[PDB]
């Protein structure tokens, strides 16, 4: 038959289901970033847990090792590219010091609210889900869309949105048309 198509899981659950310290930390963290459920926090922790594992393996190698230099710099460059890592902390020791709030800062939901286009973070998600926000000339309706540094300046209302110069929406047309 045809070749299999690869797929993989993008999250992992905690070993202890009930722990007040972790439950309170997650809910406090979900409320700050307007997340739908706990799985969106597990997803960040999962990809950060494997970033650390990659960093540990390179750190055991000698400095100036060809693999450590190539993949370590590439991983740092990618993290700097998405704005998670600062430009003055490209040492692979600050990579281990990264925290989940660094990643939630770079979501589309966080940037829409932090750019003043929305009143609150929960307004940001519904704006995104309702096809109002466009990055560049492309409409993006994924709240977890990770904004790159060069894409940061191009977040604005969609050109065909009611809030960004488009026509009036369904509700207004029904009222003013009577």
């Amino acid at each position: 038959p045809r070749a299999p198509r690869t797929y993989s899981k993008t999250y992992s659950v905690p070993k202890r289901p009930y722990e007040s310290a972790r439950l309170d930390a997650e809910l406090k963290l979900a409320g700050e970033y307007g997340l739908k459920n706990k799985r969106e926090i597990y997803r960040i922790g999962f990809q950060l847990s494997k970033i650390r594992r990659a960093a540990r393996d390179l750190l055991t190698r000698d400095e100036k090792d060809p693999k450590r230099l190539f993949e370590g710099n590439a991983l740092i460059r990618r993290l700097v590219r998405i704005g998670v890592l600062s430009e003055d902390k490209m040492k692979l020791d600050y990579v281990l010091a990264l925290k989940p709030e660094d990643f939630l800062e770079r979501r589309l939901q966080t940037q829409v609210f932090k750019l003043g286009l929305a009143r609150s973070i929960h307004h940001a998600r519904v704006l995104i889900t309702q096809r109002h926000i466009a990055v560049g000339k492309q409409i993006v309706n994924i709240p977890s869309f990770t904004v790159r540094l060069d894409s940061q300046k191009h977040i604005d209302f969609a050109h065909n949105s009611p809030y960004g110069g488009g026509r009036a929406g369904r509700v207004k047309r029904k009222n003013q048309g009577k």
């Binding site: 038959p1 045809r2 070749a3 198509r5 060809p66 230099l69 190539f70």
Partner: protein, 259 residues
């Protein structure tokens, strides 16, 4: 298993064709021909995946049935014909001549050549022996049989094929200092000069090859193809990159400067 296989699973195709996983269940099974199945390039892959002249397998058959494609100066209509190393492909409608030479990345490069260079080819001598009525002959890497060769020609030498009469113009003796491209193994596509030939009776002889950057690698004698009488003097035009292998860090640096 009661007989010869006639299909090729997509996953089982040679990796240097660079076929995608999900385009279908099967891959083009190269026909019997001058080149081995694993070391060939079917014309369907060349006309559709490489040149992208044809959009699908139906179109490559339409191209070849109008007599456009010539391999080594003869019109070929077999869509899965196993073209191989040093083969010449002529499309006089587009006025293009190609030679199948490996690039340094291990794949068959799209190497355009002039019409003057497309009038001959090189073949590695596999064996020299006597035929019926005591007539000596040479077998090249593409299955060619040339009678009455120069009596100095021996195995592992390279001959220059007139490619229109099939005769030998001249040859290169296998010896230290000859220019070589590697046609097998993980050093496939690299170009260098012979530094030292290490003999092993009953086993496999090993050849030490020095890159233009004075990088040394070892490969089996069966993967050695003599292409020049000395360094910097190849008998055919080399593909872009000149068969010099760069490390991934060097490639990243070169790519950064180019862009």
């Amino acid at each position: 298993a009661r007989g010869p296989k006639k299909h090729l699973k997509r996953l089982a195709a040679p990796s240097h064709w660079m076929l995608d996983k999900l385009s279908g269940t099967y891959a083009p099974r190269p026909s019997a021909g001058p080149h081995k199945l694993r070391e060939s390039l079917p014309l369907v892959v060349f006309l559709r995946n490489r040149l992208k002249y044809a959009l699908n397998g139906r179109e490559v058959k339409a191209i070849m049935m109008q007599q456009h494609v010539q391999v080594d100066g003869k019109v070929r209509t077999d869509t899965t014909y196993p073209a191989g190393f040093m083969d010449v492909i002529t499309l006089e409608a587009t006025n293009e001549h190609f030679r199948l030479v490996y690039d340094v990345k291990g794949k068959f490069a799209v190497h355009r050549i002039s019409a003057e260079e497309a009038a001959y080819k090189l073949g590695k001598v596999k064996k020299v022996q006597l035929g019926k009525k005591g007539v000596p002959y040479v077998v090249t890497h593409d299955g060619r049989t040339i009678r009455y060769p120069d009596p100095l020609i021996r195995a592992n030498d390279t001959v220059k094929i007139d490619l229109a009469t099939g005769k030998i113009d001249d040859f290169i003796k296998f010896d230290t200092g000859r220019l070589v491209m590697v046609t097998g193994g993980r050093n496939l596509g690299r170009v260098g000069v012979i530094v030292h030939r290490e003999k092993h009776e009953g086993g496999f002889d090993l050849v030490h090859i020095k890159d233009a950057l004075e990088n040394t690698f070892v490969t089996r004698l069966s993967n050695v193809f003599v292409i020049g009488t000395e360094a910097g003097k190849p008998w055919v035009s080399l593909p872009k990159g000149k068969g010099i292998k760069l490390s991934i860090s060097e490639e990243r640096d070169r790519r950064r400067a180019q862009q």
